[PDB]
Design a protein around this ligand. Structure first.
Ligand SMILES: Nc1nc2c(ncn2[C@H]2C[C@H](O)[C@@H](COP(=O)(O)OP(=O)(O)OP(=O)(O)O)O2)c(=O)[nH]1
Ligand SMILES: Nc1nc2c(ncn2[C@H]2C[C@H](O)[C@@H](COP(=O)(O)OP(=O)(O)OP(=O)(O)O)O2)c(=O)[nH]1
Ligand SMILES: Nc1nc2c(ncn2[C@H]2C[C@H](O)[C@@H](COP(=O)(O)OP(=O)(O)OP(=O)(O)O)O2)c(=O)[nH]1
Ligand SMILES: Nc1nc2c(ncn2[C@H]2C[C@H](O)[C@@H](COP(=O)(O)OP(=O)(O)OP(=O)(O)O)O2)c(=O)[nH]1
Ligand SMILES: [Mg+2]
Ligand SMILES: [Mg+2]
Ligand SMILES: [Mg+2]
Ligand SMILES: [Mg+2]
Ligand SMILES: [Mg+2]
Lengths: 278, 284, 285, 286
């Protein structure tokens, strides 16, 4: 079970807060933005993860995350000169991927939903690819998919559907070859169409009960932070807390939780971890 | 007119968001935290500013702020090995300060108030020192000052298990040149303490207190909680009252540190969001 | 046979001046009057016959809002009380309404949220005998009824030295024997028939279960201006980000087949100038 | 004599707000810690207006009286008139002809919330205008939804388009005595309503309409929906908590303008002593 996190980009819409800080290290309430797409991968049972970022920020991620062994993970890093193409992920990560299937998630994508893990299990347990769709109200702004669970149409910023394609994708090994033989528009949407034309593209539907934030602007960033702070405070759970997820899925034990909770013992984050482990 | 911004520290209460990012580069809504104490200095007419930070973060501030010439400022930088003592600021910055008076502001202090500039003018136009007091509800947690009617300080208790006032001392201070010598001859506490320096001035009857009461906001960005409160406050004021708080480009323009053409060039890289657009609207 | 009581009186004096001319339980929690929440909680437990107890002055205001509840497939009845002390006085005022049946009791300003709350409530309804109270973790047990459980072990109303972090919430399930308990109950020191006394009695008899609302559950008390705006923010946030409504009686009545799509559409008519009416139309297609 | 007078329009159905307005008047809904009507009322107080007519529905008018009384507790004279909800906001000057008499008159909508350090100065100017009318304009981003005004540099209005866009006209107006006669000789609009906009145009055609500009630093909330209601509440809670002041607190305003003294403040603060509202008032008087 392998996955890739795309954690580069400029976040230019976010100036000036991204002038000296990577977008994916901005706080979403009490956690760095990257904790979220990472937790999404952990929740799907993915433990070997390649993080692709900029030359300048990649060291910052390593300082934050290390090799991920503290959480029972294997984290690797690859710098890209940020040449256009999100589908370039499968090229940069060809070695990492090898012969295995692969999930891909954007570093600024925030997913929430009690049933997301089941949805992701199905996508892992699939040949072909699974994309995740989310009902929006402004399909024009997003890649739109129209589906049967099999995809019918795919229009990058059209609207034949209310469903936007999200930044979470599941591929079988054949994607690496697709990416390598892909003509520049390198677009993930093109790759996804290919699968659809082959009748190998399923669509996981995230409807009522799911939240999906894109952290485009200052506005959505503060809305995301307010959402996480609200859910956590009112419903007594943490969202995308890697230590908690690592513990609940037995990637690590209570003793390791306690050691990790040490440096966090000055705030509610460390305390929550101690409560949890008793 | 000179000032110092203390922008180091660990921000350990803020783990894990400060593990790989300096506290003073965290966003307060649409701006890096350091824009705020910096704007406070600009609003007092201070244009020559020394930023003291850590070895690791100082480069990050330079990448963000440069030499400040884009805003009509002169920004200099000094790394400190973070040896205990906030009053060590006057020692690290002895050369920078020279013979001039000096203001000092903490990098995580966020001040808001229509009349703050007038308050700061008075402090700049003073011998002695001016501290800024803010009415709190839990004086026990803060350095507390009890002052006279003339504005002269009477008492100074760093975290009084027994408070004599509701007024906390904030992280904004104005000193005359004599502070450099005070700092140099200061005995370490049970750290070189800004509170000790402030007492010295008070014992000399040279310490005024600027009062920030009704209409003023003062946020300390201690925790995750206060950080999200600070961000919500800024977003709310800005959206409902159509003004920006602590926007250096706007302040630079309004005080003629720069002209409209320079504003427009700066607004270019920001044109994908409301920040850039606000700056263009402003210059027409 | 499934019956419930909503306590919707009181002064809400902490809430002056907003409660000077408006009942606390008619204050908006985002897009709904406060009373929709505890009412929906009852509906979710399958309770359809509900007695609303309130003040002389406000009872008419509730009736104007809610009617007899037939629009939602319910039977709502009303009883005015002179606010004689005692929340446990509910079982006395409602003795006739209750008759021989079991009974649930909810406070008019209690707001419960949780995907699994309905299952929790099913279990409490399906309890042959005894009572079920609902516990929630609070950081200041001192101002709440405090429970310690195995079946309950200890109960203290506003304990100076609380023995646990678990507050007893304003949602209770009783068997028919509660009416007699209430009638033979001695007023407490403050001169009030106390729900906590009643709950202790059940516990002393080894008949008191505790439903635990832990991770995933929200419980708001609308004590102050602060908590009121927090509750509203919570509801607005959940609804907007997760595309569901919390405690929307029309939705609940439809999903549990108390009413059909045609009735939903008629009810959605007067609400068609806002998202609430539109949500109901979307729902029914 | 010349009496500063004002009218608050506090009826309507608030149908956009169902179901929260099914059994509660819109203007009694809380905006954070105060009934909605405290805000437009405070706006009037801040302009020195102390004689105020509150026009509302048959059903709600008693609820306002229970809340506000005759206003003497705050140094005011409040009077009430119930209208059958007949078409026309400009009908205010007809219903209130007797109340107004020979005086000038301000008019404010019961769901309008104004905030701004300098609002009082703006309002002083409008009260001190010897003749004509003053409307208050607010820069919006969607002029197409609001009455729009286009004005000169002197401050004189040029154009007035009810939902055009050539600045929205807000629900705060200042008139001289001549408005009563304008209202009485006004023809109903196409929707059969006596329109404040028609009245305002008349003044403009006469070159007697000034425009007070509320730009940077001013907030204006309309409490149209559930959304704006919770935004207004958040705004008031935020400003109050972060900046240590209350917005549109009548007791505070009455005290600061000497409508009442410290002893009267303390008596009023008594029933509010279980919350921060009562405590704020006690702190204030020491
Ligand atoms: N490794 C890498 N990742 C990228 C690059 N561009 C974007 N990403 C990541 C960042 C996001 O998490 C995700 C897509 O987000 P966006 O494209 O909206 O972020 P971007 O940095 O472009 O923000 P911006 O469009 O400048 O406002 O992919 C890139 O050139 N290289
Ligand atoms: N240059 C420098 N600045 C510092 C140092 N410690 C704190 N500061 C700055 C950071 C703050 O803006 C201000 C005082 O804030 P704090 O002491 O609460 O920040 P600190 O990083 O200690 O956070 P923490 O106490 O670890 O939660 O002074 C230091 O060792 N060196
Ligand atoms: N029928 C009736 N219901 C009441 C009475 N007192 C309180 N309730 C309701 C209102 C609440 O929904 C629930 C308990 O809430 P509270 O006792 O905190 O409300 P209360 O009106 O006392 O607010 P306050 O204590 O004045 O701030 O029981 C009463 O005297 N009669
Ligand atoms: N006395 C009186 N006042 C009214 C009437 N209609 C509206 N108002 C007040 C209520 C508001 O504070 C102000 C204008 O607000 P709106 O017309 O948006 O409130 P309305 O109740 O019509 O809300 P709605 O349009 O039904 O969503 O004038 C009325 O028929 N009679
Ligand atoms: Mg992009
Ligand atoms: Mg600090
Ligand atoms: Mg209560
Ligand atoms: Mg209307
Ligand atoms: Mg309106």
């Amino acid at each position: 079970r392998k996955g890739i996190i795309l954690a580069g980009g400029s976040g230019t819409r976010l100036y000036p807060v991204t002038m000296a800080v990577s977008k994916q290290l901005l706080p979403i309430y009490d956690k760095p933005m990257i904790y979220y797409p990472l937790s999404t991968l952990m929740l799907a049972g993915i433990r070997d993860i390649l993080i692709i970022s900029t030359p300048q920020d990649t060291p910052r991620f390593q300082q934050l995350l290390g090799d991920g062994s503290q959480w029972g993970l294997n984290l690797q890093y690859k710098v890209d000169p940020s040449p256009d193409g999100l589908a370039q992920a499968f090229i940069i990560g060809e070695e990492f991927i090898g012969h295995d299937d692969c999930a891909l998630v954007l570093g600024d994508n925030i997913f929430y939903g009690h049933d997301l893990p089941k949805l992701m299990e199905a996508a892992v347990n699939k040949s072909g690819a699974t994309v995740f769709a989310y009902h929006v109200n402004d399909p024009e702004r997003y890649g739109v998919v129209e589906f049967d669970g099999t995809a019918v149409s795919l229009e990058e910023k059209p609207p034949k559907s209310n469903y936007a394609v999200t930044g979470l994708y599941f591929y079988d090994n054949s994607v690496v070859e697709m990416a390598k033989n892909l003509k520049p528009s390198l677009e993930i949407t093109d790759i996804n169409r290919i699968y659809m034309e082959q009748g190998r593209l399923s669509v996981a539907m995230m409807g009522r009960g799911y939240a999906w934030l894109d952290t485009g602007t200052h506005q959505s960033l503060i809305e995301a932070s307010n959402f996480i702070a609200t859910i956590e405070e009112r419903q007594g759970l943490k969202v995308s807390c890697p230590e908690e997820i690592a513990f609940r899925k037995n990637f690590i034990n209570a003793q390791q939780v306690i050691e990790l909770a040490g440096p966090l013992s000055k705030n509610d984050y460390g305390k929550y971890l101690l409560k949890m482990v008793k």
